[PDB]
Structures are given as C-alpha cells and as structure tokens.
Design an enzyme around this catalytic site. Structure first.
Site, PDB file in Angstrom:
ATOM      1  N   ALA A  11       0.905  -1.154   0.000  1.00 34.52           N
ATOM      2  CA  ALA A  11       0.000   0.000   0.000  1.00 34.52           C
ATOM      3  C   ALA A  11       0.954   1.215   0.000  1.00 34.52           C
ATOM      4  O   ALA A  11       2.184   1.048   0.066  1.00 34.52           O
ATOM      5  CB  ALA A  11      -0.868  -0.033   1.254  1.00 34.52           C
ATOM      6  N   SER A 128       3.980   5.763  13.020  1.00 28.94           N
ATOM      7  CA  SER A 128       3.150   6.940  13.068  1.00 28.94           C
ATOM      8  C   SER A 128       3.751   7.963  12.106  1.00 28.94           C
ATOM      9  O   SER A 128       4.970   8.044  11.938  1.00 28.94           O
ATOM     10  CB  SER A 128       3.118   7.445  14.519  1.00 28.94           C
ATOM     11  OG  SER A 128       2.264   8.575  14.705  1.00 28.94           O
ATOM     12  N   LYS A 183       1.988   2.737  20.892  1.00 30.81           N
ATOM     13  CA  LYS A 183       1.393   3.238  19.646  1.00 30.81           C
ATOM     14  C   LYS A 183      -0.095   3.538  19.849  1.00 30.81           C
ATOM     15  O   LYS A 183      -0.569   4.610  19.470  1.00 30.81           O
ATOM     16  CB  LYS A 183       1.583   2.201  18.497  1.00 30.81           C
ATOM     17  CG  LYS A 183       0.951   2.596  17.172  1.00 30.81           C
ATOM     18  CD  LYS A 183       1.496   3.936  16.687  1.00 30.81           C
ATOM     19  CE  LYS A 183       0.488   4.782  15.957  1.00 30.81           C
ATOM     20  NZ  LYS A 183      -0.028   4.102  14.737  1.00 30.81           N
ATOM     21  N   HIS A 186      -0.496   6.559  21.961  1.00 32.36           N
ATOM     22  CA  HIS A 186      -0.195   7.691  21.098  1.00 32.36           C
ATOM     23  C   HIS A 186      -1.492   8.136  20.416  1.00 32.36           C
ATOM     24  O   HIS A 186      -1.840   9.314  20.454  1.00 32.36           O
ATOM     25  CB  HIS A 186       0.884   7.284  20.047  1.00 32.36           C
ATOM     26  CG  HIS A 186       0.885   8.153  18.826  1.00 32.36           C
ATOM     27  ND1 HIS A 186       1.353   9.454  18.732  1.00 32.36           N
ATOM     28  CD2 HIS A 186       0.264   7.939  17.649  1.00 32.36           C
ATOM     29  CE1 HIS A 186       1.025   9.990  17.576  1.00 32.36           C
ATOM     30  NE2 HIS A 186       0.362   9.081  16.904  1.00 32.36           N
ATOM     31  N   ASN A 187      -2.197   7.196  19.816  1.00 30.42           N
ATOM     32  CA  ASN A 187      -3.439   7.484  19.116  1.00 30.42           C
ATOM     33  C   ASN A 187      -4.529   8.007  20.027  1.00 30.42           C
ATOM     34  O   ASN A 187      -5.276   8.913  19.640  1.00 30.42           O
ATOM     35  CB  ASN A 187      -3.903   6.239  18.412  1.00 30.42           C
ATOM     36  CG  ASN A 187      -3.251   6.074  17.059  1.00 30.42           C
ATOM     37  OD1 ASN A 187      -2.147   6.529  16.785  1.00 30.42           O
ATOM     38  ND2 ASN A 187      -3.948   5.459  16.143  1.00 30.42           N
ATOM     39  N   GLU A 190      -3.856  11.467  20.603  1.00 31.64           N
ATOM     40  CA  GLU A 190      -4.173  12.178  19.360  1.00 31.64           C
ATOM     41  C   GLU A 190      -5.670  12.529  19.329  1.00 31.64           C
ATOM     42  O   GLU A 190      -6.045  13.673  19.036  1.00 31.64           O
ATOM     43  CB  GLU A 190      -3.786  11.273  18.194  1.00 31.64           C
ATOM     44  CG  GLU A 190      -4.227  11.654  16.791  1.00 31.64           C
ATOM     45  CD  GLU A 190      -3.973  10.549  15.787  1.00 31.64           C
ATOM     46  OE1 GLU A 190      -2.809  10.355  15.398  1.00 31.64           O
ATOM     47  OE2 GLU A 190      -4.937   9.859  15.384  1.00 31.64           O
TER      48      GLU A 190
HETATM   49  O1  LIG Z   1      -2.245   7.962  13.697  1.00 31.94           O
HETATM   50  C1  LIG Z   1      -1.145   7.583  13.089  1.00 31.94           C
HETATM   51  O2  LIG Z   1      -0.124   8.260  13.254  1.00 31.94           O
HETATM   52  C2  LIG Z   1      -1.088   6.296  12.237  1.00 31.94           C
HETATM   53  O3  LIG Z   1      -0.716   6.607  10.895  1.00 31.94           O
HETATM   54  C3  LIG Z   1      -2.477   5.492  12.232  1.00 31.94           C
HETATM   55  O4  LIG Z   1      -2.730   5.294  13.606  1.00 31.94           O
HETATM   56  C4  LIG Z   1      -3.781   6.051  11.489  1.00 31.94           C
HETATM   57  O5  LIG Z   1      -4.042   7.446  11.647  1.00 31.94           O
HETATM   58  C5  LIG Z   1      -5.146   5.296  11.939  1.00 31.94           C
HETATM   59  O6  LIG Z   1      -6.171   5.502  10.974  1.00 31.94           O
HETATM   60  C6  LIG Z   1      -5.828   5.621  13.326  1.00 31.94           C
HETATM   61  O7  LIG Z   1      -6.710   6.847  13.452  1.00 31.94           O
HETATM   62  P1  LIG Z   1      -8.328   6.731  13.626  1.00 31.94           P
HETATM   63  O8  LIG Z   1      -8.770   5.615  14.666  1.00 31.94           O
HETATM   64  O9  LIG Z   1      -9.019   8.037  13.889  1.00 31.94           O
HETATM   65  O10 LIG Z   1      -8.837   6.362  12.240  1.00 31.94           O
END
Ligand SMILES: O=C(O)[C@H](O)[C@@H](O)[C@H](O)[C@H](O)COP(=O)(O)O
Ligand SMILES: O=C(O)[C@H](O)[C@@H](O)[C@H](O)[C@H](O)COP(=O)(O)O
EC number: 1.1.1.44
Lengths: 473, 473
Positions: A11, A128, A183, A186-187, A190
């Site tokens: 991908a 990430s 990880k 981290h999310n 976010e």
């Molecule tokens: O966040 C990041 O740095 C990663 O590349 C990956 O974790 C991606 O963003 C996912 O889609 C999760 O985000 P969601 O749960 O909001 O879709």
C-alpha cells in the site's frame, strides 16, 4: 542474499517506507499478496533505485541477508497470522519478523512468545506519521524480543524522523507488546488533542462569533506560543481552506467522526487496569455522539438550550482564556496518558523510559510539538516522576492557566457549548488535587446495601462493617 | 422427587433466597460445596421449614421434581463451569440450570448454546437487592433459553419484589445473556447515581459550609420530592449516623472506593459498541481516582486551587439548585443507560421491553425510585421511544432544571469542587442537542493527516479526499 530487509504489503505506507529505506542505502526486497503490484511498483516509484522485487515468498526469503529481516505491513488481524504461518517453515533460527501494522498489543505478545520458542525473533513496531511521514521520516516504536533489536536498529533509526539534536524518533520501547501498546496510547492522546481543538473552535464560533478567517488567524498565533504543534498548525490551514466556489470547505463537511479502534482500545485498557484516563474517554465518546447525527437533528428540534445572553466582554481577552484553557486541559490529558503507560509497565513488567517515549513522540508522529520536549525534560530531571503535574513546569503552567480555564468553562456552560474534554480535565484536576474526596460516602453506601466493608482513615488495612440499619431498636 | 427447586451455594444470599422460596410454599433442596454448611443451615435458619438438605450432587438431583430446576449461586467464573460440568451427566433432557451469580454476559451465552444442544435448558438471572432484599423480595432479571421460563416463572415471580399495582419485579428479559447484560447495566447506573449524590454532597460541604446534620436534613427533604429513592434515603441515614464516641462516622472513613467489575464492564461495553455512556464512564474513573489516595495527599501539597472567594448568595436557593442539577444529571445517565440496552438489543438480536426492564428496576433493586415508574410511563405510551429525553416528561423536567444546573456547575467550577458526572451530563446534554457539532473539524483533520476521507453534509454516502497540503504551487 543481496537485500538487507524485505517489506510485505505494498500500500502507499509500505511503498514510502521502502523508498525511505532505499534513500538511506538499504537494499529492500518488496513483496505483496497480489504479486502484480510488485512489478507495478518496480516500473514506477521504484525505477532507478536499489530495491529488488520478489514474486514468491520462497524467492523473497532467498534474497535476504542472514539474519533474514522481514517487515509485514498488512491489515491487522488474521492476515498477520496467515503470513507468519507461511514464513516460519521458510526461516532459519534467529530470523526476524517485524509487524508494523496497528495490531493490538495482546496479539503481539502471543505471537512473540510462540515465535520465540520456534527460534524466530518477533517485534511489533508502531508506525506513526502517515504517507509522507513514512516517506521522509516516521516515528517508529519497536517492541518484542530484544535479540532482534541490534539487527534492525540501523535501519529503523536511520529512516526515522530526527529531532534538532540529531536523535532519532525511534528506540526500543520494551518487551512483548510494549511498542504496540505505546502506539495505541499515542493514538488515544491524538484523539484527545483533536477533541480539545474542536472545543476551542466551538467557543470561538458560537460564543465569540468569529468567522473562519479570524478563527484561522487565532490558531496561527497559538501555533507560535506553547501550543506550537502539527495539529494546531494544520487546523489553521483547514479553517483558511476554500473550496472551488470561493467559500470555506469545513462548514460543508459532515460532522460524523470516524474511528478505527485504536482510540477506544486506550480507553478500554484504562478501564481494565483502573487508571482515570478521562479525557481520551470523553474524546472517544464525543466521536460516538457525532455518529448519532440523525438523532441530534431530531433532538435539536425538541430539546431546549439556555437563555440567549449576548457575550459582553473583551473578545481578545476571551480568546486568550480559550488558549490557556486548551493548554491546561492538554497538560491533564498527557498526565493521564503517561499514568496509563506507568500502570501497563507495572502490569506486564516492562521497564519503560518515559523520556524515551516522549522523544519518540517529539517528531514524525501526528502529536509532535515542542510540548513533548518539555515532557522529556520533566522525565530527564526525575526519571521516577510519578505524575507529570508534580513536575514544576507543569505545576506552574496549570497554576498560571487556572483563571482563564475556569472562566472559559463557566462561559461555555452559560452559553450551552458542549465541552466534554475541557470539563473532564478540570474535574480530574480538582479531583487529583483533593486529599479528601467524597468517595467515603460511596464506601459507606456499599457497606449499607451490600456489606462490602470499609477502612478507617487512620489504619487502612482493618475492614469494618457497621450495622447501619438501626443503631437501637 | 419432593423438592421443587435446588439452590447450590449457601452464603447469606443463597440462604435468604431459599427461605424466601420456602415462605412462598416451594420445597427447596439446599446444597453447598463444603457440605457441612448444609447441616448447619438446617439446624439453624432452616429449622421448622419445608426445605430438604442434600449431601451429594447425585442425592440433590434425585430429590428434584422433573423438570429438575437448580439454581447456582457460587462465585462467578470457573466455579459455575465446574458445577455445570458435574451436573450434566446427572441430568435429563429438558432440565434447567439457573446461574444467579454476577456472571458476565458473554459466558452466559456460551454456556447457554453449549447446554442447549446437550438438551439442558440454561438461564442466567441477575439478582439485585442484597441480603434482606433476597430474603423478602428481590429484583430478578432472568434470560437464556425461553423453554425454561414457564417452569421457573411461578417461583421467580413469587419471591420477587412487588410494585404497588401487584406486578412482580421480575419477568423474562430476553435470550442468551440478556438478563446478565441488564444486571450489569443496572449496576452501572447504580455507580452513576452514587457518584451524582457524592457531588451534591461535596457542594453542600465545601461551597455551602453545611454540617452533616443540615446536610442529612437536605437529603431527607429531597427524598420527598422527585428524588425519592432508596439511595437518597440511605444517604440521609449515613450522614446522620454517629459512631460510639458521639461524633459522625462518615468523615472518619477512608475515601478509596472499591469495585467488583460490574460497573467497568458497562463502560467497556459502551466503548465496544460505540454508545456515549459518559456518566457511568466518569463514575467508574472517579472510583479509580479515589483509589489513588496516597498520590492525592501528595498532590494536595503541591497543586494549587482557585482564589478562595466566599459564597455570597441565598444558601437555601443554592440548595435548590443542587437538587435540580442532580435530578437533571440523573435523567441523562438513565437516557444513556437505556441507549446501551437499545444498542445491545440491535447487536445480539434481543427483543427487549424497556418498560419491562424499568418495572423490574422499580423495586427490590438498589436503584429503586418513583423515577423508574416515570420511565415505564415513557415507554408504555411509546414503546419505540428512541431516547428518554425525547419524551415530554423528561423534556420538561430537564428544561425546568436547566438554570439551576448551569448555575451549580459554574459555581462548583469557580470554587474548585470536582464534578466529573455533573459536568459530563451537561456536556452530553448540550452535545446531543446540537444538530451541527464541531466533529467535522475532526473529519477534516483525519483526512489531512491519514487520508481517511469525508462526507459532504448534502449527500452522505459519497466520500471525498481533498489535497489539503497545497491548493496551488
Ligand atoms: O495515527 C497515526 O499516526 C497512524 O498513521 C495510524 O494510527 C492512522 O491514523 C489510523 O487511521 C488511526 O486513526 P483513527 O482511529 O481516527 O482512524
Ligand atoms: O448491586 C446489587 O444489587 C447486587 O447485589 C450486586 O451487584 C453487588 O452489590 C456487587 O457487589 C456489585 O457492586 P460493586 O462493583 O460496587 O462492588
């Protein structure tokens, strides 16, 4: 033996990571489930590069230098296992499989133990940064079996993002699922920061009456103060953005936010291990709420809000209050996320380096900001720091913001602007502050109706049950 | 064949349920893992009653009328399975095992399917009410294989609590784990109501400066208004309670609240199925927070609160504001809990009768109050009601409380009193109300950094990705 590493999964994330590795002098052998995509890549993005292509798994394993290092970047779940199962008869003892997909941490420890006693060294790394993050410098969070680490260290830390001091945003996190758990957190963090920004935005739009140009101007200023971050930066871009008809694009897009599990898993882990990670909790539920779009249309028709009192006050001062409310609330989210890491380390026996983790979130990743640097400082001067708020920088920052923060919550409350994350941060702040909290009433209640017993404040350890029902008669 | 039913597990809950059954003309055969306790019971609490004793499993099965009905009230987990495993070689096809322990719903559906194709009919029932609730009239929530129900109906609805209209607080909830899922949500809602009360208490103590006698007086008044409930009633008792030295006992007990999983499971289920059950979320985390007692002592030494501004205002009026803030927030918790039930019905294909569930929570159980009666009314007049807040009674109640509620949050916020559940209820209320919410910014952000795509507000269904990075150059 020619290729230093193989990557299965072509991908855009995979392709960019291969190209990044190649730009750093590592010969990569590419592979994909649908093998046609390998030729496609080699003719196009990979033309004139050092990368090799493979047309079978058995061919891809023979292209590799020993110890065979191979990265998997396929959809998490069964596919990872299916690929693991196929590779093991083909691999020698001491060979390294690396899962870079967003796998949940408990699968990673399962796979790590199983492969460990088959002699195969496993590591689950979180990546990430997204497409061009992956291309020119991602944040990588590897964890698993440490015998793997010296073999992949040069590649991983080379393709990784660099902090102005030359350090890579990548280092060994810990055993088993530590990299993948980090990880996930981290999310989580976010999600929290995104929700916080949305609330600031809502106060500007509906209390203060700002159009998106002044609103983007306010965000740009904020990105030059303590709030300097990737997310504040791009929010200013998003607000300024005009569609093909001249008008602003943002008020046109549908307010139903998606989710791909990583944020709710953080929240579930905190519930399972008893850690008050409230803001990520609220952020995840605030997305679920927005999904209920049809109900909300119907609810707006029926449910009534507060008396419309116009904001009479210096808008510039209120704009400052929203800035400090946001920064104060950000501090609590990060303190809560770092409490979760502290507890998972205790639960699974990981020795984590929190300043290490902060340094890994300083660049490459979505949550990057100067702020993570201040958190590395906090942990450098006291590695055993129990909570972020007990560090003088954060202590003083929250103490400075307190007024503005209380004023922005009360004004939002007055005007009826929903602040799930701003309010829960203040609730947690005032809750954490209080030496005595009314949870003794909950303990008295549980003992009255379900005889659960309670401790006396002087000598915890003894447990009493009182016959509350009648103290006479 | 002599006994109508057998109960295995002679803790006080078991004994009281046996005695309750016997008081209603059902011959019960008692059994326990440690068989000595059976004789002990028969000589003491059960002397001069119709109950039979058993000294082996094989003997207990021969005492039973066919269809053999047997209740298990052992510690949830492995013990239930161990007992199930032992009973199946001893039972005929069409015999009924009933698990009354606080088992989590997914074990119940596992066991129900497995036993169903071995010809054994299973039902997991939740029991609520505690020791003397169990003794004179519990709330029972049975679910599982409906072929069982006509055989146990007479016993279950007979020992159950009765609502002034003569109805039992017990009826068939649904298939598989429905009774146990409902039981879990019951507990979730119990946690919420306890936390809500604690917050009201905190505002009285620290803003208003009330001693526990005036504070108990305020609670007694409230128990005569819309807040008439078991929990409000006993909180007034708890506040009045004086220990052996003449002084009040409550300020002496330790503020670290316990948990036995049922409340966090509700919260985890809401996260897993995407339902914004925020107040139970906050209640569970507010208990985790109080567990961190040593940290909070240390935090109180370091972290600073707001400028101490004395409350200048009519205390009686503020006391009224706390009453209405509490009732309004209660309404949102219950709406959220009933959203979770609606979603689990959709996920597992249960046909639930929400007014039925309300009637089952009206008496016997911990959360009993006049309030559940108002919720049965809401569902009786519209069975397909999508959310509790869309019903006119609740619509008008929240609309009436709105002022007081906003005023109590802003004053709590000013004075620094933590209100995790009062604040999250207002956030959810204002969030649910708004037809347009700032989650479109979250969708714009996700598309900028992870290309997740977004929908246009006119024609959902189409998904766009914008090249946000540069619209020129
Ligand atoms: O966040 C990041 O740095 C990663 O590349 C990956 O974790 C991606 O963003 C996912 O889609 C999760 O985000 P969601 O749960 O909001 O879709
Ligand atoms: O609540 C009830 O009606 C039941 O008798 C039972 O559920 C009991 O109370 C548990 O102990 C759960 O409560 P906790 O998780 O707080 O202990």
């Amino acid at each position: 033996a020619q290729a230093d590493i193989a990557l299965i999964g072509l991908a855009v994330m995979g392709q960019n990571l291969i190209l990044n590795m190649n730009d750093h002098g590592f010969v990569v052998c590419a592979f994909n489930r649908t093998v046609s995509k390998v030729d496609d890549f080699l003719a196009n993005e990979a033309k004139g590069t050092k990368v090799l292509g493979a047309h079978s798994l058995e061919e891809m394993v023979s292209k590799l230098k020993k110890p065979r290092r191979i990265i998997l970047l396929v959809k998490a779940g069964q596919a990872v296992d299916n690929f693991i199962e196929k590779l093991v008869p083909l691999l020698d003892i001491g060979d390294i499989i690396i899962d870079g997909g967003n796998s949940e941490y408990r699968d990673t420890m399962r796979r790590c133990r199983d492969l460990k006693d088959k002699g195969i060294l496993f590591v689950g790394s979180g990546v990430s940064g997204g497409e061009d993050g992956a291309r020119y410098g991602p944040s990588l969070m590897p964890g698993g079996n440490k015998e793997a680490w010296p073999h992949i260290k040069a590649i991983f830390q080379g393709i990784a993002a660099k902090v102005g001091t030359g350090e890579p945003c990548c280092d060994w996190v810990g055993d088993d699922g530590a990299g993948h758990f980090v990880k996930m957190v981290h999310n989580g963090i976010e999600y929290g920061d995104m929700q916080l920004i949305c609330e600031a935005y809502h106060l500007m739009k509906d209390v203060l009456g700002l159009g998106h140009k002044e609103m983007a101007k306010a965000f740009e200023e904020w990105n030059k103060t303590e709030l300097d971050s990737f997310l504040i930066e791009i929010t200013a871009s998003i607000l300024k953005f005009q569609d093909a008809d001249g008008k602003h694009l943002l008020p046109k897009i549908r307010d139903s936010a998606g989710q791909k599990g990583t944020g709710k898993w953080t929240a579930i882990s905190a519930l399972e291990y008893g850690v008050p990670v409230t803001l990520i909790g609220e952020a995840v539920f605030a997305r679920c709420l927005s999904s209920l779009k049809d109900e909300r249309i119907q609810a707006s028709k029926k449910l009534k809000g507060p008396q419309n009192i116009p904001f009479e006050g210096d808008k510039k001062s209120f704009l400052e209050d929203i800035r400090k409310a946001l920064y104060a609330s950000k501090i609590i989210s990060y303190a809560q996320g770092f409490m979760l890491l502290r507890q998972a380390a205790t639960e699974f026996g990981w020795t984590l380096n929190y300043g290490g983790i902060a340094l890994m979130w300083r660049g490459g990743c979505i949550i990057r900001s100067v702020f993570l640097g201040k958190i590395k400082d906090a942990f450098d001067r006291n590695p055993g720091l129990q909570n972020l708020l007990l560090d003088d920088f954060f202590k003083s920052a929250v103490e400075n913001c307190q007024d503005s923060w209380r004023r922005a919550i009360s004004t939002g409350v007055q005007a009826g602007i929903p602040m799930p994350c701003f309010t829960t941060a203040l609730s947690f702040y005032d809750g954490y502050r209080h030496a005595m909290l009314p949870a003794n009433l909950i303990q008295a209640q549980r003992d009255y109706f379900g005889a659960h017993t309670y401790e006396l404040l002087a000598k915890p350890g003894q447990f009493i049950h009182t016959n509350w029902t009648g103290h006479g008669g």
